[PDB]
């Protein structure tokens, strides 16, 4: 019917002076462009069809050709940045924003989708979509008393498009647009659909990825408790962005971090630090490292929740990227901790896995570990126990590793290892 047309035939139909012929050819293009196997996007662009599709978006009197053109353009804009740019260059942004008000839900939804692809291209097109006024009509589509009366697919596509308006940095989204979107995001974060939850979590994770003033705008909306609840979900597509957002938040101030602790986040970390997905373990250990970079009373909460043995665990056995994050967690803990906290750390068994990791090729982790060792010796000095520690490091092979590190290409490694040996192993 409209299946498997050539681009030449599509062009002949769209260039006819016959609206129904144009509609049939546009539908044929839509079908070509929605085939999984190598849709001929560049041929359609080269044939000059984007401006015709864009003008069809304005044909209020023929809603089927609005829909077919919107779909075709959606799939072109889903391609490379140069393909998305061809759509933008054809004037698509304001035409799609005008379609957001369509009385036909499948057309408004297609416009939502196209704008999500355009904005998802990167900061510049995101910001251009915002400048053409997309946020007001997008948010109006969600101004219903109960989100559950909306079609599920429709709500998921709106949530995803909103998340692309929150995505990307250099620059981050405009502050005023973030403040305009955030109350709707907060509402979507309490909706009962797993895809809506995952994508509104991702949006929050984007918005907390930056300076502490962005973190603050999010935390002030009171979402940390809901994020902690989602952190405890069974669905990995929800836990993943929830954990990224929580981790981002604890990169901020001591007070921002404290909101995460206050909300009960630490009780989830026995599972996260042993999670079967390596990326979850890595990001949870990164998060812990930012918490152990906090105040002594926050380190103490880590202790109270039983998480130091879990850190020992990941230092002992985990993917190497996770072990690096654990090494950071230990260096921060030893930098900021009380003497009693550092003693506890040693009694949980940190020394041996810490030493075993000095045989690693990564220079930065060696530096991190040597700083931690030095911090621990400084705690031992205040107790006159430097000798017991030296013995402990000797019994597990750590002295050999420090010696060998003296002969290390990097300067900081050589210096720190030589200082350690001369000061505690001579």
């Amino acid at each position: 019917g409209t299946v498997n047309w050539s681009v030449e035939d599509i062009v002949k139909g769209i260039n006819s002076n016959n609206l129904e012929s144009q509609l049939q050819a546009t539908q044929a293009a839509r079908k070509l462009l929605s085939r999984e196997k190598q849709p001929p996007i560049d041929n359609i662009i080269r044939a000059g069809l984007i401006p015709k599709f864009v003008s069809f978006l304005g044909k209020t009197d023929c809603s089927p050709i609005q829909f077919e053109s919107a779909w075709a353009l959606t799939n072109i804009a889903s391609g490379t940045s140069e393909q998305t740019k061809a759509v933008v260059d054809g004037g698509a942004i304001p035409a799609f924003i005008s379609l957001l008000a369509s009385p036909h839900a499948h057309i408004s939804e297609q416009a939502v989708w196209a704008l999500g692809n355009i904005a998802g291209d990167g900061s510049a097109f995101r910001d251009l979509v915002i400048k053409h006024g997309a946020i007001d009509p997008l948010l109006a589509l969600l101004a219903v008393p109960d989100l559950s009366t909306l079609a599920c697919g429709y709500l998921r596509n709106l949530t995803w498009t909103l998340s692309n308006l929150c995505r990307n940095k250099n620059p981050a989204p405009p502050l005023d647009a973030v403040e305009q979107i955030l109350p709707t995001l907060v509402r979507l974060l309490h909706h009962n659909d797993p895809e809506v939850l995952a994508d509104s979590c991702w949006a929050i994770s984007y918005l907390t990825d930056g300076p502490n003033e962005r973190i603050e705008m999010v935390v002030k909306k009171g979402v940390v408790p809901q994020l902690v609840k989602l952190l405890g979900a069974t669905e990995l597509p929800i836990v993943t962005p929830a954990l990224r957002a929580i981790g981002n938040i604890v990169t901020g101030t001591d007070e921002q971090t404290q909101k995460v602790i206050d909300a009960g986040a630490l009780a989830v970390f026995p599972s996260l630090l042993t999670n079967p997905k390596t990326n979850i373990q890595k990001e949870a250990t990164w998060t812990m490292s930012n918490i152990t970079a906090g105040r002594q009373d926050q380190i103490q909460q880590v202790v109270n929740h039983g998480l130091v043995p879990f850190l020992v665990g990941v230092l002992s056995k985990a993917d190497f990227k996770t072990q690096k994050e654990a090494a950071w967690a230990i260096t921060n803990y030893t930098s900021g901790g009380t003497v009693e906290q550092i003693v506890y750390l040693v009694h949980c068994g940190i020394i041996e896995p810490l030493m075993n990791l000095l045989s690693a090729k990564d220079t930065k982790i060696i530096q991190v570990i040597l700083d931690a060792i030095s911090n621990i010796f400084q705690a031992a000095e205040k107790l006159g126990e430097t000798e017991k520690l030296s013995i402990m490091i000797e019994e597990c092979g750590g002295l050999d590793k420090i010696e060998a590190l003296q002969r290390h290409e990097n300067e900081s490694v050589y210096k720190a290892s030589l200082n350690l040996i001369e000061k505690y192993f001579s």
Binding site: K31, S34, R35, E36, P39, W71, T74, N75, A77, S78, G79, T84, Q110, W113, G116, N117, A119, G120, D121, W160, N164, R167, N168, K169, N170, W202, S205, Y206, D209, G210, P241, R244, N248, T251, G252, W286, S289, N290, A293, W328
Partner: peptide, 21 residues
């Protein structure tokens, strides 16, 4: 305190979605 770099990846899922047949 260690943030993600500005060059970091916010999401391994790409931002764009095609609408399949």
């Amino acid at each position: 305190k260690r943030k993600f770099p500005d060059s970091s990846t916010q999401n391994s899922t790409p931002p764009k979605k095609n609408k399949p047949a």
